[PDB]
Amino acid sequence: SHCRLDKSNFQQPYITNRTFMLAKEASLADNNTDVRLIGEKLFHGVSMSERCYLMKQVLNFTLEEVLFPQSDRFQPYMQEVVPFLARLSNRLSTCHIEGDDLHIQRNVQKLKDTVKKLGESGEIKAIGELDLLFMSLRNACI
Amino acid sequence: HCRLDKSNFQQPYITNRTFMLAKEASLADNNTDVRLIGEKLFHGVSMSERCYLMKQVLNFTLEEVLFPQSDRFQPYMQEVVPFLARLSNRLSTCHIEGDDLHIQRNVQKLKDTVKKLGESGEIKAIGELDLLFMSLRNACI
Numbered sequence: 001s002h003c004r005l006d007k008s009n010f011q012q013p014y015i016t017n018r019t020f021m022l023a024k025e026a027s028l029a030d031n032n033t034d035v036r037l038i039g040e041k042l043f044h045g046v047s048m049s050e051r052c053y054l055m056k057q058v059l060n061f062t063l064e065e066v067l068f069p070q071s072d073r074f075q076p077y078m079q080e081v082v083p084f085l086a087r088l089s090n091r092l093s094t095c096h097i098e099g100d101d102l103h104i105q106r107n108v109q110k111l112k113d114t115v116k117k118l119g120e121s122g123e124i125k126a127i128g129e130l131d132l133l134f135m136s137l138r139n140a141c142i
Numbered sequence: 143h144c145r146l147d148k149s150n151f152q153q154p155y156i157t158n159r160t161f162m163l164a165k166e167a168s169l170a171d172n173n174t175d176v177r178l179i180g181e182k183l184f185h186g187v188s189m190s191e192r193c194y195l196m197k198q199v200l201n202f203t204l205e206e207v208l209f210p211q212s213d214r215f216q217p218y219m220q221e222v223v224p225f226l227a228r229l230s231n232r233l234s235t236c237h238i239e240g241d242d243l244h245i246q247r248n249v250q251k252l253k254d255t256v257k258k259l260g261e262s263g264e265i266k267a268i269g270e271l272d273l274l275f276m277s278l279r280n281a282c283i
Contacts, residue, residue, distance in 0.1 A: 011164065013272075023280060027280075132181050
């Protein structure tokens with residue numbers, strides 16, 4: 001199936017506010033001012049029709065290796081945002097692209113590598129960038 | 143430098159109305175069409191430059207989009223614009239250290255997209271006012 005998310009997923013003020021507030025709080029705990037996770041490099045070579053699928057991979061990675069491990073932290077917003085993002089992941093579940101995703105895998109791997117290079121603060125940074133994740137999912141999938 | 147007091151964003155009513163205004167305008171905008179506010183807007187922009195970046199976007203949107211559409215999208219527009227104008231007023235002349243070229247270039251892209259699309263460009267911009275509001279908050283508080 002084609003990866004996509006109705007725009008209504010990103011137009012509700014309550015959860016959108018919680019998401020941005022969680023990002024702000026985490027960013028205040030992130031001192032890595034030299035690294036950006038969601039940016040040009042992540043999308044390099046990815047065509048518009050594959051962006052949502054790319055974001056699906058970034059989302060699932062962020063859920064499994066960042067948000068879940070940090071799920072009991074950044075209370076109480078974390079506990080409201082995680083279920084929201086997980087539902088989006090579930091909606092995208094198993095959707096795919098009809099083309100080769102080798103370039104997408106490489107771009108995601110670099111993001112994963114960057115988070116590990118940063119260690120714990122890598123996870124903190126990812127949470128601090130939930131605002132960019134939110135906007136990237138919306139922009140690539142609606 | 144650019145910054146805004148937390149109090150300025152502790153407005154649940156206006157937040158909800160901003161999202162309603164964005165939803166309404168979004169109805170007339172093709173969702174799968176090009177976007178305006180996103181990661182690309184922040185390309186090469188440090189965290190300390192974000193509020194200044196959003197200030198540019200906020201002012202462009204107010205003067206080139208909202209004011210011109212100030213009589214449409216009632217009754218949402220009539221409440222949101224005054225609020226956004228106040229914030230613009232608060233950010234008066236606040237700026238950054240040296241060389242904002244990368245910032246202006248990123249903003250130029252958003253501006254070109256809106257202008258090339260004419261009226262539809264304005265509608266698209268209003269449809270993304272929710273992202274503008276949230277981005278401004280996180281970049282300036």
